[PDB]
Amino acid sequence: EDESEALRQARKDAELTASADSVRAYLKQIGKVALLNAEEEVELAKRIEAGLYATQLMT
Amino acid sequence: LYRRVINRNNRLKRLIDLGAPEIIVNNEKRMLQESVDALFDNGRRGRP
Amino acid sequence: VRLTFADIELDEETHEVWKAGQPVSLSPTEFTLLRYFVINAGTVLSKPKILDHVWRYDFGGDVNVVESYVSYLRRKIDTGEKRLLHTLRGVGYVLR
Amino acid sequence: NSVPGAPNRVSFAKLREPLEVPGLLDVQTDSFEWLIGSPRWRESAAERGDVNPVGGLEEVLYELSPIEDFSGSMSLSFSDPRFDDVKAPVDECKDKDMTYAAPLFVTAEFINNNTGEIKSQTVFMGDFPMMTEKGTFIINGTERVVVSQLVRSPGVYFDETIDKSTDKTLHSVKVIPSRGAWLEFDVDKRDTVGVRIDRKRRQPVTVLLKALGWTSEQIVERFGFSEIMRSTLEKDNTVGTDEALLDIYRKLRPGEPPTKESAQTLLENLFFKEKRYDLARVGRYKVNKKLGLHVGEPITSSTLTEEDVVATIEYLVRLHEGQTTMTVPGGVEVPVETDDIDHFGNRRLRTVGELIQNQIRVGMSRMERVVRERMTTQDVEAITPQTLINIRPVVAAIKEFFGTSQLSQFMDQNNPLSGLTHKRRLSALGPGGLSRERAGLEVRDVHPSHYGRMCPIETPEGPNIGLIGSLSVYARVNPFGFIETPYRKVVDGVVSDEIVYLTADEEDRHVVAQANSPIDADGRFVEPRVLVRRKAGEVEYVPSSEVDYMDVSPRQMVSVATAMIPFLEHDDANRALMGANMQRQAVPLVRSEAPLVGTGMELRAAIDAGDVVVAEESGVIEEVSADYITVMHDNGTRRTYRMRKFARSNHGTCANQCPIVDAGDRVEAGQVIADGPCTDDGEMALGKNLLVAIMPWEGHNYEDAIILSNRLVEEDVLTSIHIEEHEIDARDTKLGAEEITRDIPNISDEVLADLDERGIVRIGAEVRDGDILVGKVTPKGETELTPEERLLRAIFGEKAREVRDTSLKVPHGESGKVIGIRVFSREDEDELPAGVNELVRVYVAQKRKISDGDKLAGRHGNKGVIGKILPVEDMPFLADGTPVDIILNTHGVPRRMNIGQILETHLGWCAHSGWKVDAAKGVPDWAARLPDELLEAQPNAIVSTPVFDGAQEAELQGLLSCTLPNRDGDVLVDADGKAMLFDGRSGEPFPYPVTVGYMYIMKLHHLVDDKIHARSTGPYSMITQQPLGGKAQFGGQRFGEMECWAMQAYGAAYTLQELLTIKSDDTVGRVKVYEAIVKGENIPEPGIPESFKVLLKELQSLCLNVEVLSS
């Protein structure tokens, strides 16, 4: 079923697939990153603002 | 076919000169490779 | 054998132009320009057409000469309320 | 005769048929009536299968409705598809390039369940093209016919194969549904049973059965005898419904992680949900009948079902075990046997209605997608059905079918036979069927189920031999698209008058007798053993008390064109095929004399082809002219039939119509009023009766050539009207507007004499090659003026001539008179393509006389070109002095086995001369069974020989015996059909008598005037400088690889060099060779062909470093 090495190897072998169609391959590759929410996006904005400010300072 | 190849190449060079995630850049590179393969042989690989 | 377009009446043999009974004296260049316009009513004539026919081929100058002459003809016979000698930008001129 | 105005046609038929030929356009008319939903079809469904009368449009509407949102609180539905009066009459639509169409409206219901809202609107669905009363569509002024196509019916098919490794007998089954994913089962070389699904070559039946909610215990309980797949189950190596589901998921959908619920929902969605997989109603019926599932239940839930799948598996395993009968639980007992893919019980016929319904289905699928998107996007409580529906996909789809689809073709109308044969034709190409690149010889063969369904003689001869045929004359289409044919039934060995229509499915379950069987006027056959067709297509003898069916008539197995071949049974199969194929290429002459010998089919063919005006209501005829005929009906009203004259058909032949009635005679309903192009007195007449001798003459009829007298030229016996149309359009352009005007620069005056002030040639002004039909002058301005042009206008006084003359000139190689002109312009409200302000079409006629090189043919496949036209004096003439009209070689008959043409010759002479059988002491023995009213015939009589109940040889010999003399007492033709001829050149009598008679000869549409081409220098292609090809361009012959091989075989090198270099590619070589040949010097050395340089640059552009090395 779910545990005892039952379907994890199936998921791994599924992810290790050619997927010769480029659109399907792109969808597979885009599938590996989780969605965000309001909090995560706002602190990401804080981080990029800090990076831009530091880059301007070094310039 | 030539227009497709030119569009893909120009978009790729814009992407690399602007800075983008490697997955985006790799998808663009795969598109460019498929465009060149379509130019020489349309349908030799995958659907034409 | 009289060249006509609505208002404008050009006669070759007697060499003057009428605006519904209004004659006006024109320069020879402008006269040839008007004549070879009127015989091509409703048709676009491009700048090389104009220069090669009205002027001689060996005209080695710049083109705005025809621009000035079309201005002359406009202020002379187009001076009525309606505009006849219309311009198509980058293409040429048509009387219509 | 059963036709009020029929001319008398004495017949040699011995037997009386029970039922008359059906309406020959039923195949198209009934299908379109079903699609639309007319009250006539309503009554037809009421009298036959009233359980569920639903039209095609109603069915697609009811299937699409209701369209739901994700919430489900509001929905849309369609109902009541109604039509409206057509836009314009057929003649008007054909005249002004419209489309014979009608508006369509649908009563859309938008419902809202959250609060309760009903919105009713008559939404305009578009302008549906309509079908004329003659079964053709009018599209942009062209007559188009949608030919019915043959496709395998969706369903379940079993087949058996030999592995050839161990001679093991393997069995496979395919469930092939229309618009779905395939299902497959088979038995492998070993005992394993494969269920490769959707082209995934794994999964024995164990995993599928387990994923279907079944356990191993249930499998062994239900399926116990199947030791083969019981062992397969023992090698399942996968236990658990969830395990089987995940295995199926990870096979069919790689790259995605299986879930507990996605597996179940995908397995259900693949087949058991009609949104993604549905056999049509025909497919569901086929599966139900094959497996005996439901026999007293209506058709619904067209998608596949789990018990259907398990029944399929049970059938397959029982078949492989060698069984012969199975009874599915809850289902009726049914035989177990493999299915033939080419049997006409499985090859269904997609007709016009079905094709139109499918295209509508595509359009409305796009409709549903767009409306669901817009109904999600737009705000609720402010939405309307009008704001939701956007008919553009539907109208675009119907247009995209009706134009540019190989199942919709120009209705070729050389003659009414060609039209009627283009309709009622069965193709096997197009989308959804096999193609010429795919055809198998087994497909091209003649299946025994064809008898009475599709003709085995009438078919195209070229590469598509066997893929196109014609409906049998008595055929009909079942409501499910299966071809069925009538047959009588015999009870107690006595034939009833009861007629039942039988499909090829039930024919195998019966033993159908023969049409021409020795009936006893009571019901019984004289001989106990009769020759019949059994279940497997075999023919055998059977005791009379055991047969159960009999043919309705002879010619049941034959098409409509072939049924017009006299003495068909005396002709070989392929020669009869050629004759039937040439029957439909005969051009319409100026007279169209009815044949002396024929069959009874010509009358009905001419009536049903729609090219002959018929009195739709009985009444007297008030007045008649050359264009209109007015009839005074009984009930006060009067009717006027306008008669089309000299209208050009799609293939450039005249379509003149002429009245055949008087000014006071009464006519009945259905009687011919005015004959058409190829008709005489209302019966089809494609040629002329010619006096023929069958001796070889001086070698001018060598190798199938034909000789004729010059009186055929003089009397216009063989002459035709050929009308040609030419088009030119004045269209706006960047520099202004082209104008059609008689003022055209640098032109002479005599060539302008035939041009009126409008700029178009006067009607009636005769024209020849190189002349101007339309003086159309275009605005060009000026170009590079070469010094010589300036010098010329200086020396003589040539003016500006600013415009260019792209005038309409007659194409090279024809002439003739001008009939009429149609002129279209936007200033007269006329609708024109955008950018065109004036359109002109010019019609030119040539009265083409018969000449050498033209192709003549009989009705028996005896074709040939005209070797020589001979002066009337230099022809063999009988002792009476009448010259023969046509001479055919005698070496062509016995080699090709078409003696039927000679039989026709003898009977034609007999019918031309008349006869009287002397009944002094009873009738002679041969005339005992010969019908009355045929013992005595006046000169120039007309006789009908039905194709298989024809005139026997003994009867024909007896008729030839008594052949009453012509003018004085003289029997020119002796007992054996021959006669003595005088040579018109040397005068001495011919040493031996040769046969003479009257034969029906027709002129085919292969006139040398349309096949003569020559080219010296013309256009060239762009990419490579090769000359063009075809008479449309200026042509240039193809010197192929085989011709190159022949040239090398001769050892001739210089002419090969010249044929490849300075005639086709070397541009400098071409110009230089033309200059050299005109000036008078020897031809220069050829250069390098341009095509080779093109190849060099092409290979260079493929990243290949290819170059030429000089040392």
TrEMBL record, chain A:
Q: Where in the cell is it found?
A: Cytoplasm
What residue intervals traverse the membrane?
none
Family (UniProt) = Belongs to the sigma-70 factor family. RpoD/SigA subfamily.
User: Which species is this record about?
Assistant: Mycobacterium tuberculosis
**What highest taxon heads this organism's lineage?**
Bacteria
What protein name is recorded for this chain? RNA polymerase sigma factor SigA
Q: What is the lineage of its organism?
A: Bacteria, Bacillati, Actinomycetota, Actinomycetes, Mycobacteriales
Residue range from the parent sequence:
206 to 264 of 528
Q: What does the record note on quaternary structure?
A: Interacts transiently with the RNA polymerase catalytic core.
- What is this protein for, i.e. what is its function? Sigma factors are initiation factors that promote the attachment of RNA polymerase to specific initiation sites and are then released. This sigma factor is the primary sigma factor during exponential growth.
TrEMBL record, chain C:
Q: Which domain of life is it from?
A: Bacteria
Using the record's annotation, list all stretches that form the OmpR/PhoB-type domain: 1-96
Q: Which residues mediate DNA binding here?
A: 1-96
Q: Which named protein is this?
A: DNA-binding response regulator
* Organism of this sequence: Mycobacterium tuberculosis
Q: Lineage of the source organism?
A: Bacteria, Bacillati, Actinomycetota, Actinomycetes, Mycobacteriales
**Gene designation per UniProt:** phoP
| Span within the parent record | 149 to 244 of 247
